[PDB]
Amino acid sequence: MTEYKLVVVGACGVGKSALTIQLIQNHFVDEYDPTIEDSYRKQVVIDGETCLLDILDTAGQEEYSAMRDQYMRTGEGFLCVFAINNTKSFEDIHHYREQIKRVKDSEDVPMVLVGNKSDLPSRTVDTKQAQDLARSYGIPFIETSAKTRQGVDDAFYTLVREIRKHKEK
Numbered sequence: 001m002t003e004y005k006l007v008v009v010g011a012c013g014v015g016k017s018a019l020t021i022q023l024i025q026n027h028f029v030d031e032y033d034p035t036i037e038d039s040y041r042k043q044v045v046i047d048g049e050t051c052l053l054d055i056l057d058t059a060g061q062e063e064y065s066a067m068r069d070q071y072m073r074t075g076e077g078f079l080c081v082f083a084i085n086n087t088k089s090f091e092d093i094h095h096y097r098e099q100i101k102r103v104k105d106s107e108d109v110p111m112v113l114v115g116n117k118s119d120l121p122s123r124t125v126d127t128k129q130a131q132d133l134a135r136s137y138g139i140p141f142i143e144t145s146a147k148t149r150q151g152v153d154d155a156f157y158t159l160v161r162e163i164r165k166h167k168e169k
């Protein structure tokens with residue numbers, strides 16, 4: 001069983017917890033405590049390889065943490081999540097990638113950009129915006145809904161494949 005340390009980042013309210021819970025429990029939670037930051041485990045077979053995913057769902061404080069660095073340092077892949085009806089959460093992606101790059105000291109970190117809440121009408125971040133950003137970074141963009149579960153497996157499996165492509169697992 002190979003292990004993969006995944007870290008889910010993004011602004012409050014984008015659906016980091018809901019996405020993780022969908023993967024790890026197959027249900028949609030509508031009010032998961034915003035103060036709970038924890039690691040979760042899922043056993044999945046991905047391309048005939050039994051994987052144990054260790055998924056860190058971030059929460060809490062924003063100011064430069066020194067132990068944030070630590071878990072961020074050992075994470076092998078990062079889901080960068082924004083919500084398509086939250087323009088600021090998309091803008092914040094520049095900052096999350098900047099910070100991930102600094103800690104990993106690389107422009108080549110396994111990362112997937114996730115645009116969540118695709119089930120909601122009248123998005124404020126259009127697909128072109130998200131594609132242009134993912135293309136600039138050289139990473140996949142995946143649209144998700146934690147509500148309907150559409151794209152959830154895609155997002156997490158893709159990230160596992162990005163980790164494999166960067167390093168032997």
Ligand SMILES: CCC(=O)N1CC2(CCN(c3nc(OC4CCN(CC)CC4)nc4c(F)c(-c5c(C)ccc6[nH]ncc56)c(Cl)cc34)CC2)C1
Nearest residue numbers: 010011012034058059060061062065068069072095099100
């Ligand atoms: C509602 C509860 C909830 O769901 N959560 C998720 C939550 C975690 C904390 N989070 C962050 N916020 C900001 O900065 C803020 C001011 C500046 N704007 C842009 C100008 C962006 C926002 N920086 C962050 C940051 F740098 C990192 C980070 C990274 C990636 C890598 C190495 C690192 N070492 N140390 C911090 C750090 C991390 Cl992990 C989170 C935030 C806010 C959102 C709280």
Ligand SMILES: Nc1nc2c(ncn2[C@@H]2O[C@H](COP(=O)(O)OP(=O)(O)O)[C@@H](O)[C@H]2O)c(=O)[nH]1
Nearest residue numbers: 012013014015016017018029030117145146147
């Ligand atoms: N319509 C819709 N709501 C969502 C989706 N994902 C999360 N939510 C809701 O958005 C709010 C924040 O979700 P949460 O997972 O707590 O976000 P976090 O703060 O990033 O962990 C909650 O009310 C969730 O039920 C989604 O895909 N669609």
Ligand SMILES: [Mg+2]
Nearest residue numbers: 016017033034
């Ligand atoms: Mg949460």
